[PDB]
Amino acid sequence: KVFGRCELAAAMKRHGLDNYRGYSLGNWVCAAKFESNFNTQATNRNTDGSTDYGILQINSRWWCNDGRTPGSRNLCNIPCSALLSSDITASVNCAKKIVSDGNGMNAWVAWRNRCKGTDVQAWIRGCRL
């Protein structure tokens, strides 16, 4: 599923990301924009052999199981496929763990490089929320 911007904002809101770990909703929407272009089915193969899955590009190196990431963990306790779902619940719940892992949203390289410090209000402009 390719979410609209405001559609995604509403869903992330509902599931409790606005202010999660102190990160305003716009942070999360901006991160998803540059991680997945709002596409739940997005995947990305990393140099180390791990893969990123879903609208927040959750990495198989720690967070989900894909059966092809040697030495990896599954701290979110779910098959990486469950992160490609049209429904974002598994991705959000797992994102909550990731952002709690010590470095906040810096865990998403694209957030650090493209969203951090920017006008992330703008990502939820016009959105009936």
Q: Which residues bind Na ion (CB under 5 A)?
A: 60, 65, 69, 72, 74
Q: How far is CA 32 from CA 9, 68, 73, in A?
A: 10, 24, 23
* Residues 65 to 124 in contact with Cl ion, rule: CB under 5 A: 104, 121
43 touching Cl ion, by CB under 5 A: no
User: Which residue, 70 or 102, is less far from Cl ion as judged by CB?
Assistant: 102
What is the identity of the amino acid at 77? N
User: Which residue, 45 or 128, is less far from Cl ion as judged by CB?
Assistant: 128
Is 87 labelled a binding residue? no
Whether 35 is catalytic is yes
Token pair belonging to 102: 């010590």
User: Which residue, 57 or 69, is less far from Na ion as judged by CB?
Assistant: 69
Whether 52 is catalytic is yes
* Member of 6, 11, 13, 24 binding Cl ion (CB under 5 A): 24
> Longest Cα pair distance anywhere in the chain, in angstroms?
44
How is 23-82 classified by DSSP, letter by letter? B-HHHHHHHHHHHHTTBTT-EEE-TTS-EEETTTTEETTTS-B-S-STT---TT-SBGGG
* Shortest Å distance, C-beta 69 to Na ion: 5
**Catalytic positions, written as ranges:** 35, 52
